[PDB]
Amino acid sequence: EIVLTQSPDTLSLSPGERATLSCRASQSVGSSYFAWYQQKPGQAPRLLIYGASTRATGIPGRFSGSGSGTDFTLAITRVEPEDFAVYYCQQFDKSHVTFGQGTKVEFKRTVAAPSVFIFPPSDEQLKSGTASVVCLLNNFYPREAKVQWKVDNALQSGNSQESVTEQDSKDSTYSLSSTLTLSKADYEKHKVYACEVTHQGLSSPVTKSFNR
Amino acid sequence: QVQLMQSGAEVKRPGSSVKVSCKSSGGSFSDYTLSWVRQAPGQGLQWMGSIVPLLNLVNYAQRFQGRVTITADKSTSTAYMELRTLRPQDTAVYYCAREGAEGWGWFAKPVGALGVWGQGTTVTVSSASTKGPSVFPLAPGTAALGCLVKDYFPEPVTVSWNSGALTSGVHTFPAVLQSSGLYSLSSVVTVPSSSLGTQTYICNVNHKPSNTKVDKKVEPK
Amino acid sequence: GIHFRRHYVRHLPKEVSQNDIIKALASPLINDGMVVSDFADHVITREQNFPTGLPVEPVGVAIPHTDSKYVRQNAISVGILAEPVNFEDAGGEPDPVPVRVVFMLALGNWFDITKWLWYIKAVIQDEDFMQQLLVMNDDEIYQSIYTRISELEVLF
């Protein structure tokens, strides 16, 4: 089939900059059979450009598609807060449809350090027989942050899960939540529980801990 | 012009089948192609098949190798999508889409690209059975607190704070799938430390699949 | 674009079968390199399990075609029948469509099918023109169809 490769994976810019998205094809696609789509979190995709260069109805003039053969380009002249989303290219030239992997256009702000809060497991949860330790990283940019768990200064691995919120429309920052899962018995055999956080906006790894 | 209304969310066991329907609205039903595109949680779009109802011509993504059957009921203007022998990796949002058209009425020129989309149907494939969540408090310048919504199935869970009267600083994180097959999420809120002793904070958890509604007051230990 | 030559229009005599109709409307496309040599049998095979009879109000219209992999270049072949020849209904009705106008489609992309049914809408729309198709001669039908479809897509 015809493979579509989008570039870049993430585009980080402030409102007002030009946004240029590239879609490369492994074979030539007819311009009549190429289309761009926009998808916001929680919603279905929306048609932006069809026929490689024609705007769908109700799509503002700041969107312009171009290209032919194997190289297609989507341009956004002055990016606006409602233009930040994921964009997919699509072809349907040879009786089959393929999409690109998607390009997330994110709001670019100044570097922001995260606030770290560690939460010991609640009393009613230990009654049930399990111990969950939560490490919260609140309002940071960029998204790239690394959390690490240490019990009695012993690095943990394979017993925790992470979750990152979408970019907040408030301050353009991200938030992260990690959850260290332990049995009730293993939670008693240790004293100190810590979550060490490394981020671009931190001069050194910040550590928040508590004593059981 | 055209509206596509799909059926509700579905929960199925691995190896079973799913029939998603999609009812069309104002506009020629048979003259334009209907397509089905799915999207796994956190991933991209995958085409499954297209159908032209007027000629009853269906074109499939050959990667499914017969696992997909797409039919169209012209009398009720409804298209159907049947995915058999389901695997856990088939968990995705299944979209109904109609190709766009330049103009209006019977002479609207087909465009090819998908201009009209359905709201999407969530299909969860898992061996887990329905379970309501248990809610544990995350007890607390500025301070943080929250509630842990652990061990529930299926998605989704809606979380509010003080019956919606608290929306500043709230962050409900996307749920994680645990090794047991049950989901877990966290909902935190940053508040002033000076309010801890005198401001009530209540996390409202509603799990519609199990009709479970939990209110957990959060206080410092 | 799409190729539409003068010899792609042809009147067919009486007592012709459905297969002879398809074979006759495929000869110009085969001789011009628009399709594979086996294009006639592939259209016959599709029409048997995916009929293309359209119960148009003036006269019956049929649109026999096949998959795109047997098509080299986009073209249409028009055949005017002397007597009504039944093509089973593409809708699903248990009774067929008495057809007098046949459009043999050879498109290179499955997703253009909906766009080519739209071109035939521009020819089918005029009731009086469908009546004239049965009385006009060969070159009269070609000029009228060429210009009517030329108003949008590129021809020849």
- Concatenated DSSP letters of A112-138: BPPEEEEEPPPHHHHHHTEEEEEEEEE
Given a contact cutoff of 8 angstroms between Cβ atoms, the answer to whether C41 and C26 are in contact is no
CB atoms under 10 Å from CB of A155, counted, come to: 9
Give the integer Cα–Cα distance in Å for B14 and A178: 29
- Give the 3-state secondary structure percentages of chain C, helix then strand then coil, rounded to 5: 45, 25, 30
Sign of CA dihedral A6, A11, A15, A16: negative
Which residue in the set C114, C121, C122 is minimally distant from B52, CB to CB?
C114
Cα torsion through C50, C30, C124, C131, rounded to 10: -120
- Residues of chain A with C-beta less than 8 angstroms from the C-beta of C110: 95
Cβ pair B55:C92 closer than 8 A: no
CB atoms under 10 Å from CB of C106, counted, come to: 25
Q: Which residue of A has its CA nearest to C112?
A: A95
Residue of A144, C55, A101 lying closest to B54 (CA atoms): C55
Domains of chain B: 1-123 (no CATH), 124-221 (2.60.40.10)
Give the integer Cα–Cα distance in Å for A149 and A13: 33
Q: How close A95 gets to chain C, by Cα (Å)?
A: 5
Q: Which two tokens stand for residue A189?
A: 């055999």
Q: How close C72 gets to chain B, by Cα (Å)?
A: 20
Which residues sit opposite C49 in a β-bridge?
none
- Residues of chain B with C-beta less than 8 angstroms from the C-beta of A37: 45, 114
Interface test with A, best of B48, B158, B171 (most A CBs within 10 A): B171
Given a contact cutoff of 8 angstroms between Cβ atoms, the answer to whether B173 and A165 are in contact is yes
What angle do the packed helices C138-150 and C113-124 form, to 10 degrees? Answer: 120
- Give the 3-state secondary structure percentages of chain B, helix then strand then coil, rounded to 5: 5, 55, 40
Given a contact cutoff of 8 angstroms between Cβ atoms, the answer to whether C97 and C18 are in contact is no
Cβ pair A122:B184 closer than 8 A: no
Given a contact cutoff of 8 angstroms between Cβ atoms, the answer to whether A162 and A155 are in contact is no
CB atoms under 10 Å from CB of B214, counted, come to: 17
- Residues of chain B with C-beta less than 8 angstroms from the C-beta of C117: 31, 54-55
CB atoms under 10 Å from CB of C24, counted, come to: 18
Helix or strand run (H / E) with residue A105: strand A103-107
As a whole number of Å, the end-to-end CA separation of chain A is 57
Residue type, A203: S
Residues 6+ apart with CB under 8 A from C85: C16, C17, C18, C21, C98, C99, C100
**3-state SS class at C49:** helix
Which residue in the set C67, C69, C109 is minimally distant from A93, CB to CB?
C109
Q: What is the CATH number of the domain that holds C149?
A: 3.40.930.10
Residue type, C53: G
Q: Which residue of B has its CA nearest to C112?
A: B112
Residue type, A75: A
Give the integer Cα–Cα distance in Å for C40 and A38: 43
DSSP A85: S
Residues written for chain A? 212
User: What separation in angstroms does the CA of C5 have from each of B187, C56, C73, C146?
Assistant: 69, 25, 13, 9
Q: Which residue of C has its CA nearest to B58?
A: C110
Cβ pair B47:A97 closer than 8 A: yes
Give the integer Cα–Cα distance in Å for A88 and A99: 6
Residue of C110, C67, C109, C74 lying closest to C2 (CA atoms): C74
Residues 6+ apart with CB under 8 A from A43: none
Which residue in the set B44, B59, B176 is minimally distant from A102, CB to CB?
B44
The residue range of the domain holding C124 is 1-156
What angle do the packed helices C18-31 and C39-49 form, to 10 degrees? Answer: 140
Q: Which residue of C has its CA nearest to A34?
A: C111
Cβ pair C68:A93 closer than 8 A: no
| B113 Cβ under 8 Å from any chain C Cβ | no
Beta strands in chain C (DSSP E): 9-12, 53-54, 60-62, 75-87, 97-106
Which residue in the set B61, B143, B186 is minimally distant from A134, CB to CB?
B186
Give the integer Cα–Cα distance in Å for A14 and A18: 9
Domains of chain A: 1-109 (2.60.40.10), 110-212 (2.60.40.10)
- Residues of chain B with C-beta less than 8 angstroms from the C-beta of C111: 33, 50, 59, 112
Give the integer Cα–Cα distance in Å for A178 and A196: 11
Which residues, numbered 4 to 43 in chain C, qualify as contacts with chain B under a Cβ-Cβ cut-off of 8 Å? Answer: none
Q: Nearest-5° angle of CA B8, CA B11, CA B12?
A: 130
Given a contact cutoff of 8 angstroms between Cβ atoms, the answer to whether A131 and A35 are in contact is no
Which residues sit opposite B31 in a β-bridge?
none
C-alpha C3: how far from its chain's center?
Answer: 13
Interface test with B, best of A163, A173, A195, A210 (most B CBs within 10 A): A163
**3-state SS class at B18:** strand
- Residues of chain C with C-beta less than 8 angstroms from the C-beta of A30: 109
Cβ pair B55:C115 closer than 8 A: no
Q: Nearest-5° angle of CA A102, CA A103, CA A108?
A: 155
Q: Work out how many domains chain C is built from and give that number.
A: 1
Which residues, numbered 78 to 117 in chain A, qualify as contacts with chain B under a Cβ-Cβ cut-off of 8 Å? Answer: 88, 90, 92, 95-102, 115, 117
Resolution (A): 2.7
Residues 6+ apart with CB under 8 A from A166: A41, A174
Q: Which two tokens stand for residue A176?
A: 């992260």
Q: Which two tokens stand for residue C71?
A: 């098509």
DSSP B104: S
Q: Give one word for A139, left, alpha or beta, with left for phi > 0 and alpha for psi -120 to 50.
A: left
